[PDB]
Design a protein around this nucleic acid. Structure first.
Ligand SMILES: Nc1nc2c(ncn2[C@H]2C[C@H](O)[C@@H](COP(=O)(O)OP(=O)(O)OP(=O)(O)O)O2)c(=O)[nH]1
Ligand SMILES: [Ca+2]
Ligand SMILES: [Ca+2]
Ligand SMILES: [Ca+2]
Length: 341
DNA sequence: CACGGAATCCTTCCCCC
DNA sequence: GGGGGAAGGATTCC
């Protein structure tokens, strides 16, 4: 069983470099401007020249400028990156019929058929890196191992622009050596709950009564970790299908007035519909971000699909429902469409 | 200062043989 | 008791 994971390097910034090579070499910051004020917002990503100084995904744009006042700051252009992603995905297709697109810049390939051993797998890796660099002029990192999880881990260890195989002898040392927090699907909240249980390495999950683990982190999560420890994890590669479309925007000023929010809300639905393109949702959820950055949501499923008129109508009630049950002001508002026919 | 988007799981109902 | 779902939220990752 051989899985090959591909992850494009500093993707949004690298695409910006390709479309305008003059940028290459200098610090490049792709930002998301919220408009609340001059430079309000966050950094989507940054090229390496910028990450070596602390500027990275998540930090406020205002904070990134204090560190690199002279870098190049660019607004994020999803559509552009998405189409480039799509083309790159189509290059991988020509390497396996078994392909799972995980995000806008990640994909897993089941090359158990094609390749025979790890040596060949590695070479196929180089062929893919090479192909993509030539066609799209974009570098990516490749990770190869026994299953998806370790393939991805392989990639995190080899970036940027690397390629790495984590052979069976290593999996075993990683299950013992590797820090549980560096395992995909284990964020802060979980790692923290894991420390208390004395688990700092994948192996520790075997020296704990399952039921206490489940109690603390959930069954799904407990079975996941345990199978990994037992070197038994092996979920297949499957094409994922879009299960929900939505849009959320920041208002210029926090508000509680329905008439002040409606406009932002309607625009959100509009864009969402354009994005649905042919798809018809049965469920609609209204999502609100409270002034103290907490998230509130109210939704509804219908026994049939939702027309745009219906969406406008029903979204106002859920927004009214929200305000009636929460007293904080609202900072961000949006909609989520799901359960496609 | 803290954006925008989406999947998946966890709980708590709630209806009902 | 337990199947079946819908809601609202928790949690992770891009
Ligand atoms: N708006 C927004 N976009 C994000 C955020 N995090 C990631 N993205 C984008 C950043 C990247 O361009 C793309 C994800 O790839 P990461 O897996 O994020 O890789 P990135 O390419 O930035 O890092 P790397 O290639 O490993 O050096 O998704 C975020 O918090 N907000
Ligand atoms: Ca990644
Ligand atoms: Ca990446
Ligand atoms: Ca982590």
């Amino acid at each position: 069983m051989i899985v090959l994971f591909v992850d494009f390097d500093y993707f949004y910034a690298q695409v910006e470099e390709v479309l305008n090579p003059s940028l290459k070499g200098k610090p490049v910051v792709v930002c998301v401007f919220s408009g609340r004020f001059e430079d309000s917002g966050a950094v989507a990503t940054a090229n390496y020249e910028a990450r070596k100084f602390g500027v990275k995904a998540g930090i406020p744009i205002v904070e990134a400028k204090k560190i690199l006042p002279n870098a190049v700051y660019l607004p994020m252009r999803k559509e552009v990156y998405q189409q480039v992603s799509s083309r790159i995905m189509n290059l991988l297709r020509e390497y396996s019929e078994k392909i799972e697109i995980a995000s806008i810049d990640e994909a897993y390939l089941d090359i158990s058929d094609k390749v025979r051993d790890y040596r060949e797998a590695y070479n196929l890796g180089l062929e893919i890196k090479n192909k993509i660099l030539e066609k799209e002029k974009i570098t990516v990192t490749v990770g190869i191992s026994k299953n998806k999880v370790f393939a991805k881990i392989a990639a995190d260890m080899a970036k940027p622009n690397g390629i790495k195989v984590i052979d069976d002898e290593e999996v075993k040392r990683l299950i013992r050596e590797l820090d549980i927090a560096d395992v995909p699907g284990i964020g802060n909240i979980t790692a923290e709950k894991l420390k208390k249980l004395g688990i700092n390495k994948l192996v520790d999950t075997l020296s704990i009564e399952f039921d206490k683990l489940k109690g603390m982190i959930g069954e799904a999560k407990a079975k996941y970790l345990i199978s990994l420890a037992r070197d038994e994890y092996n979920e297949p590669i499957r094409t994922r299908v879009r299960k929900s479309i939505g849009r959320i925007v920041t208002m210029k000023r926090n508000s509680r007035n329905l008439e002040e929010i409606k406009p932002y809300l309607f625009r959100a639905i509009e864009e969402s519909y354009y994005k649905l393109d042919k798809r018809i949702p049965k469920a609609i959820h209204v999502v609100a971000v409270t002034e103290d950055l907490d998230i509130v949501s109210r939704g509804r499923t219908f026994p049939h699909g939702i027309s745009k008129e219906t969406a406008y109508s029903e979204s106002v009630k859920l927004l009214q429902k929200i305000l009636e049950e929460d007293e904080r002001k609202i900072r961000r508002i949006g909609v989520r469409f799901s359960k496609f026919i």
